[PDB]
Structure 1
């Protein structure tokens, strides 16, 4: 059953907090759609490339239209003496090119105390019933989310213009600066995020875009 793919979580990437951060700075920005690629380069001695997708992203490739909700989970890796507060903002359409308010769009304020590992699910908030599925024309896909430490990308500027395939935009902003006992200017903190599919996920089409891909990436460069 396809439900076994929509519901299998997966670790994607990490981003930093960098306590020497002002009260309103962008920490994370992503597009709400299941097709999020990850490209590696064969650490061992040869030249090879590959790509990875979450279980939700993998199962919607042979299809052309998708709809439903997606679930996100953020986990902060800090000690018992770290204090701070963060913000999560959702924009249904257009993107967030500038810092928004606190009640104009949907907002959430969460604090770093005795509890971590917050999760949130985004539902369908478009005027159309179904959206399109993202594809890639080459072996180096364009960036779909902003800094990810695994892929060696650290630009904090907001990317955009993917309205026809996505279900909005997620952003993470600081509210209260991170406090540490030792002292700043050299201290950071890492946050890990996971993606999933809500029980209302749906795909309905048939497509032939994967007709020339292959799972044999081992020796293809020569």
Structure 2
């Protein structure tokens, strides 16, 4: 009360509800703790298994393999017949029905497509892996063709421009990586409207799809198309040629995958699926 304050008056803005957009600005909040500097540890080893690094980094989702489904060869196949057709975007839905109990439904996504779904743009390469489950006395030959844009609505030429050939006489496990090649820099993220999504690959023996015709066109969300064609139909040491063999594939994300700005499309979704449809 002794002196008088001689200081220029400053200009301030009163904020009631704070800044709820950024993530690198300190907050004006109160901790309901006995002390202002209480904190646990952020280490992961305190619970058990040693961690390989940061288990909260997003690269742990881009880089975990997942079995999607399987298709079949059916050796009664001519010189060039379609066996597999898929787009090259990471949102590959997989519906199912409850076996025992009341009627229930649900979807399922690979780790690549479960982490990019909150965001709105995606970019990078994805690696597919094929494994044929067959005996060692089997001989056949297939080819893989990649079309960056448009699609493969008709059987293409055998040219070696982008064709990779795989034969059963060498091995039965292959893996290829489709990398980013588009004029634009970022594609969009696919979404579904109803509880039964549309097919992004054919055929599938798990979901019950038996179609073997090329699909539609989704160029705004996909990196292209990948199709599998037969070259030399396989023969088994049985004589009775009325049999088949199946082959299954896995999807991952190459160490160049990345995402972009945030999005809100999972607002009306929930991970609890087992008590609806009354």
- TM-score normalised to structure 2 length: 0.78
Question: What is the DSSP-based 3-state SS (H/G/I as helix, E as strand, rest coil) of the residue aligned with 2:270?
Answer: coil
Per-residue CA distance 1:29-82 (angstroms, 9 max, x = gap): 000000000000101121000000000000011000000000000000100111
For residue 98 of structure 1, report the CA deviation from its aligned partner.
1.1
For residue 23 of structure 1, report the CA deviation from its aligned partner.
0.8
Change over 3 Å in CA distance of 1:105–1:138 after alignment to 2: farther
Matching residue of 1:90: 146
For residue 113 of structure 1, report the CA deviation from its aligned partner.
1.9
- TM-score normalised to structure 1 length: 0.98
Question: What is the DSSP-based 3-state SS (H/G/I as helix, E as strand, rest coil) of the residue aligned with 2:267?
Answer: helix
Matching residue of 1:139: 195
> Do the aligned partners of 1:25 and 1:174 also contact (CA within 8 Å) in 2?
yes
Matching residue of 1:37: 93
> Do the aligned partners of 1:90 and 1:105 also contact (CA within 8 Å) in 2?
no
For residue 186 of structure 1, report the CA deviation from its aligned partner.
2.0
For residue 185 of structure 1, report the CA deviation from its aligned partner.
3.9
Change over 3 Å in CA distance of 1:12–1:209 after alignment to 2: same
Higher strand share: 1
For residue 177 of structure 1, report the CA deviation from its aligned partner.
1.2
Q: Return the alpha-carbon distance in structure 2 between the equivalents of residues 104 and 134 of structure 1.
A: 32
Return the index of the structure with the highest Cα Rg: 2
Query: Which sections of structure 1, spanning at least 5 residues, go unmatched?
Result: none
- Aligned residue pairs, count: 222
For residue 104 of structure 1, report the CA deviation from its aligned partner.
6.5
Segments ≥4 residues shifted beyond 3 Å: none
Q: Return the alpha-carbon distance in structure 2 between the equivalents of residues 180 and 215 of structure 1.
A: 45
For residue 99 of structure 1, report the CA deviation from its aligned partner.
1.2
Over aligned residue pairs, what C-alpha RMSD do you find? 1.0
Per-residue CA distance 1:122-173 (angstroms, 9 max, x = gap): 0001100000000000000001000100000010000021010000000000
More divergent stretch after superposition (97-106 vs 10-19): 97-106
Q: Return the alpha-carbon distance in structure 1 between the equivalents of residues 166 and 222 of structure 2.
A: 25
More divergent stretch after superposition (106-115 vs 194-203): 106-115
Matching residue of 2:62: 6
Q: Return the alpha-carbon distance in structure 1 between the equivalents of residues 98 and 136 of structure 2.
A: 37
Q: Return the alpha-carbon distance in structure 2 between the equivalents of residues 154 and 59 of structure 1.
A: 29
Matching residue of 1:157: 213
Q: Return the alpha-carbon distance in structure 2 between the equivalents of residues 184 and 108 of structure 1.
A: 30
> Do the aligned partners of 1:67 and 1:201 also contact (CA within 8 Å) in 2?
yes
Q: Return the alpha-carbon distance in structure 1 between the equivalents of residues 230 and 86 of structure 2.
A: 16
